[PDB]
């Protein structure tokens, strides 16, 4: 039906004046990647650009960046036309001018450095009105092609002249800004960002469309998570990109004034949002405005809570405004806030994972001139406990350290600072290391919700256990139809029991990674913390976090830790049930299997745990993790040594055959010993090499040679002479008799 | 490397209104004889007055009346930036009033007894803040700024009008000099002091530089520790030495 127009979509290629399209629709329009093409845009404009052929984009959607979507005055959800331009011309002198206040606080013929490389070889097909942009030296600034010697659209050629002059001119009211936050500025919450998009696209992008139907919109969004996870940034980006009017309602700003004044401010903000429909109301620090009802001491605070409730109910009955809120925890706010109709859907912003931290660092380093040694993959993998604004502060600290190293030591008495010295600043790996180590407080201490990086290859042996766990987890979630066909409810839990050090934790991590499911590992320290603190209710929000991260593998490491602290095998005169274990049982009974949240329990003493957790429906599968045999030990050694460089002289099969009844973590302790001996040998060789030649006053005497970059068999033999038998044989007999007594008990 | 960046050293002419020369340096300067040379130092307080009553001493160290150390400076080893600004306006006249040691004894008019014999054919090329010694007696009394009819400094003339109605005061001025805690007053937090320095140097010492870039500054500092560990002292020293305006909330 007239495949001449086309839908809009974001772009993965950031270079200006560039696009990407479906591969088959190159003959339909009948043009090529290099074929420059013009594209229409409302308010009577058309902009030309290069073409490309890709696949990920649908056969009905173009890909482009914010710059052209700004000059074309068009947002997502729209559609425009297109036409090939083989009649393109070679752009002669086409004057440009720095069109912003960004020109402020700068000096030099920046035209040269910013433009000459940007236009060089780009064959940029340029037309009048272009608002292209370029970035350097801690700054990002644009220009407008005001003149087109040949009009209107032409190519760039290196011969073409640039008489670069003019005075920064005033951007009209029609255009806008890219500083406005967008989805490109959001990282670590890709799933959460997609959820927010699918929640707010219909109410905002299609107001009249939704007014036609009589469905209830989601008009309350509870973005909860640690502080500094970009909740207000996410809200601002969503409101700006979707075009909805954003009103930043701040809890401190609200209740900073008088009670009557605070209520008047809330009412005025809600009225303005209703007038500017479609609009987004965002309330960061909602717990400040709306605490728990039993906890809000002051009558003024309760009155403010009720005023907010009434205002949002008035929005619900007659308005087109979506209300968003930010809080540390969902339970910290009043439960009446989360009432249906007011806050129906709560989005767990959560914490960024290694990939999320990488995305955040890349976002914050987009305008930062950083060296090639930054290896942000390594930084993100190392970065733990930093969420969003924590990584922003990390990048700021690295940049500030670079500036204090350059500016404070170079330009002191020579001459006043200019743009050349500032744009030459580069951020190195040492700055990032210093920011990580000395000048960064990690604000995250609670449970981690992320897809673990441990895979099946990271585990040695246990092939049967691997296959059984793969069944029990993937099959309910990868083939729900097969389970529904049969009259059996899939199991929602498994118990891992066996000698410590066999990799139950890695088994849970690998099964979470294979399903690409978040893993929340509650170790024995957490269970004992909840037990000793007499706060069993923490299991409630632990299970809530696990459910909100569906699909999730809820791992309970050292599930017998409480049963072990409250006595040993027989222990005290009491039973085996425990308050935290009881809350876990209650939550699992209250957890729907369909929620694809799997509970994995690891017990080094399965005989001391309460049998109530072994009842069918909770942990009916008791997977035994046996002590690794020869093949399993060989595989474990192969998996562990893949990271530490080891010499080929090592004999893993022989090492495994010496290690009779050795657990996997005891093999990693074997590397701890031997690999550490290798590290110590390297360090002592380095220091003795440093000390030996310092006596001789030779200007040129450097016999540079690496002592050893790998680990030889001597280190492993020394570790064998140091490391000894893994565990007592009596424990193994106990495990084997427990396995033999899997049935005919209780 | 700055040519006019030279040390100042001992002085022998007990009158502060004299400022030295250095003929090899005068060739560098345009130092003309007349009212004033703007010799600039620290804290913006200068000692501006008649010039060229020197060249008795060696070069590379300007002779400046020791009384322009407590003012305009602190101690030896400092440096002056001497650049002429002669031919000042001739307003009404400059304040006449003593400060500390005149109420002790006959006061009379406080002008026509001890101070009158000094504004003679050298009619006070001055800059408000230049403090010195002038008397008709024991030869140790100060002369301070009290009033300002012309905002910039001028060269007085007779026939003018002066009011010694003002009264000599205490060392509010001496106490003002004794202030601005510094890093020399901080001990036991050398690592913490260095951390604070590296945090606040860029935002404060380089405001326009940081405004050029678009990085987020550290605008919140939480100095936590036992009471009495110099937290407010550290903050005051950092603000005073860096020149940032300190507000004690
Ligand atoms: N680390 C320090 N080094 C030198 N003097 C100190 C130090 N800590 C405190 N003092 C001295 O203690 C005296 C009184 O302390 P002051 O009034 O400065 O408060 P403070 O020690 O910063 O207080 P707080 O810890 O409660 O913020 C001052 O004379 C100050 O010089
Ligand atoms: N996921 C993220 N990706 C990129 N930047 C982030 C992210 N989270 C936070 N930031 C940065 O942190 C700064 C402030 O964080 P903020 O949005 O106030 O966090 P919160 O909303 O949780 O209080 C913002 O300027 C933003 O650039
Ligand atoms: N079968 C295995 N294959 C590879 N690595 C293992 C294996 N078992 C344990 N490890 C590693 O060795 C260490 C010791 O294992 P440990 O965590 O004590 O096992 P568990 O969690 O079952 O008690 C762990 O850090 C783990 O990463």
From Swiss-Prot, chain B:
Which top-rank group of organisms is this from?
Eukaryota
The reported result of mutating residue 33 to A is: Minor effect on affinity for ATP and ADP
Q: Which UniProt keywords apply?
A: Acetylation, Amyotrophic lateral sclerosis, ATP-binding, Autophagy, Charcot-Marie-Tooth disease, Cytoplasm, Disease variant, DNA damage, DNA repair, Endoplasmic reticulum, Hydrolase, Isopeptide bond, Lipid-binding, Methylation, Neurodegeneration, Neuropathy, Nucleotide-binding, Nucleus, Phosphoprotein, Transport, Ubl conjugation, Ubl conjugation pathway
- BP GO terms, sorted: aggresome assembly; ATP metabolic process; autophagosome maturation; autophagy; cellular response to arsenite ion; cellular response to heat; cellular response to misfolded protein; cytoplasm protein quality control
**Can you quote a single GO CC term?**
endoplasmic reticulum membrane
Note the subunit structure: Homohexamer. Forms a ring-shaped particle of 12.5 nm diameter, that displays 6-fold radial symmetry. Part of a ternary complex containing STX5A, NSFL1C and VCP. NSFL1C forms a homotrimer that binds to one end of a VCP homohexamer. The complex binds to membranes enriched in phosphatidylethanolamine-containing lipids and promotes Golgi membrane fusion. Binds to a heterodimer of NPLOC4 and UFD1, binding to this heterodimer inhibits Golgi-membrane fusion. Interaction with VCIP135 leads to dissociation of the complex via ATP hydrolysis by VCP.
Record comment regarding domains = The PIM (PUB-interaction motif) motif mediates interaction with the PUB domain of RNF31.
Q: Which family does it belong to?
A: Belongs to the AAA ATPase family.
| Name used for this protein in its record | Transitional endoplasmic reticulum ATPase
- Which organism encodes this protein? Homo sapiens (Human)
Q: Which residues of the full protein are shown?
A: 21 to 269 of 806
């Amino acid at each position: 039906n007239r495949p001449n127009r086309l839908i809009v979509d974001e772009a993965i290629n950031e270079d200006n004046s560039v696009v990407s399209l479906s591969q088959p629709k190159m003959d339909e329009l009948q043009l090529f990647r290099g074929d420059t093409v013009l594209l229409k845009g409302k308010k009577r404009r058309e902009a030309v650009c290069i073409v490309l052929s890709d696949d990920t984009c649908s056969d009905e959607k173009i890909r482009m960046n914010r710059v052209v979507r700004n000059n074309l005055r068009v947002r997502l959800g729209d559609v425009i036309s297109i036409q090939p331009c083989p009649d393109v011309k070679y752009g002669k002198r086409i004057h440009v001018l720095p069109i912003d206040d960004t020109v402020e606080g700068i000096t030099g013929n920046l035209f040269e450095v910013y433009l000459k490389p940007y236009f060089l070889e780009a064959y940029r097909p340029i037309r009048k009105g272009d608002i292209f942009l370029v970035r350097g030296g801690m700054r990002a600034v644009e220009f407008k092609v005001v003149e087109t010697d040949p009009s209107p659209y032409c190519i760039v050629a290196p011969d073409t002249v640039i008489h670069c002059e003019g005075e920064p001119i005033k951007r009209e009211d029609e255009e806008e800004s890219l500083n406005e936050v967008g989805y490109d500025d959001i990282g670590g919450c890709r799933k959460q960002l997609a959820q927010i998009k699918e929640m707010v696209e219909l109410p905002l992008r299609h107001p009249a469309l939704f007014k036609a139907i009589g469905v209830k919109p989601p008009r309350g969004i509870l973005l909860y998570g640690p502080p500094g996870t970009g909740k207000t940034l996410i809200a601002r980006a969503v409101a700006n990109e979707t075009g909805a009017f954003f009103f930043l309602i701040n809890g401190p700003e609200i209740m900073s004034k008088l009670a009557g004044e605070s209520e008047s401010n809330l009412r005025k903000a809600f009225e303005e949002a209703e007038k500017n429909a479609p609009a987004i109301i965002f309330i960061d620090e909602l717990d400040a405005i709306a605490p728990k009802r039993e906890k809000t001491h002051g009558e003024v605070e309760r009155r403010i809570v009720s005023q907010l409730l009434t205002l949002m109910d008035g929005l619900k009955q007659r308005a087109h405004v979506i209300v968003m809120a930010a809080t540390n925890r969902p339970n910290s706010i009043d439960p009446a806030l989360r009432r249906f109709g007011r806050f129906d859907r709560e989005v767990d912003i959560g914490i960024p994972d290694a990939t999320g931290r990488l995305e955040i660092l890349q976002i914050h380093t987009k305008n930062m001139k950083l060296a090639d040694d930054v290896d942000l993959e390594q930084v993100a993998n190392e970065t733990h406990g930093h969420v969003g604004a924590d990584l922003a502060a990390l990048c700021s600290e690295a940049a500030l350290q670079a500036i204090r190293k350059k500016m404070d030591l170079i330009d002191l008495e020579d001459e006043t600072i200019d743009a050349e010295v500032m744009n030459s600043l580069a951020v190195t790996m040492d700055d990032f290391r210093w920011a990580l180590s000395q000048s960064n407080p990690s604000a995250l201490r609670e449970t981690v919700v992320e897809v673990p990086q441990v895979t099946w290859e990271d585990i040695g042996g246990l092939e049967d256990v691997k296959r059984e766990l793969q069944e029990l987890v993937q099959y309910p979630v990868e083939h729900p139809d097969k389970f529904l066909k049969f009259g059996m409810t899939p199991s929602k839990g498994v118990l891992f029991y066996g000698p410590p050090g066999c990799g139950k934790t890695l088994l849970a991590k690998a099964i979470a990674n294979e399903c690409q499911a978040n893993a929340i590992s509650i170790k024995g320290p957490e269970l004992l913390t909840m037990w000793f603190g007499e706060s069993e209710a923490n299991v409630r929000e632990i299970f809530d976090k696990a459910r909100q991260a569906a699909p999730c593998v809820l791992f309970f490491d050292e599930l017998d830790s409480i049963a072990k602290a409250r006595g040993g095998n027989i222990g005290d005169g009491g039973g085996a049930a425990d308050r935290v274990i009881n809350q876990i049982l209650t939550e699992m009974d209250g957890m729907s299997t369909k929620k694809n949240v799997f509970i994995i329990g690891a017990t080094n003493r399965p005989d001391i745990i309460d049998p109530a957790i072994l009842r069918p429906g909770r942990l009916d599968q008791l997977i035994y993790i046996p002590l690794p045999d020869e093949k399993s030990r060989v595989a474990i050694l192969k998996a562990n040594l893949r990271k530490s460089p080891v010499a080929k002289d090592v004999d893993l099969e022989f090492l495994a055959k010496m290690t009779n009844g050795f657990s996997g973590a005891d093999l990693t302790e074997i590397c701890q010993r031997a690999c550490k001996l290798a590290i110590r040998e390297s360090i002592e060789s380095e220091i003795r090499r440093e000390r030996e030649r310092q006596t001789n006053p030779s200007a040129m005497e450097v016999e540079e040679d690496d002592p050893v970059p790998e680990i030889r068999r001597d280190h492993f033999e020394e570790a064998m002479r140091f490391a000894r038998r893994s565990v007592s044989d009596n424990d193994i007999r106990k495990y084997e008799m427990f396995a033999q007594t899997l049935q005919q008990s209780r």
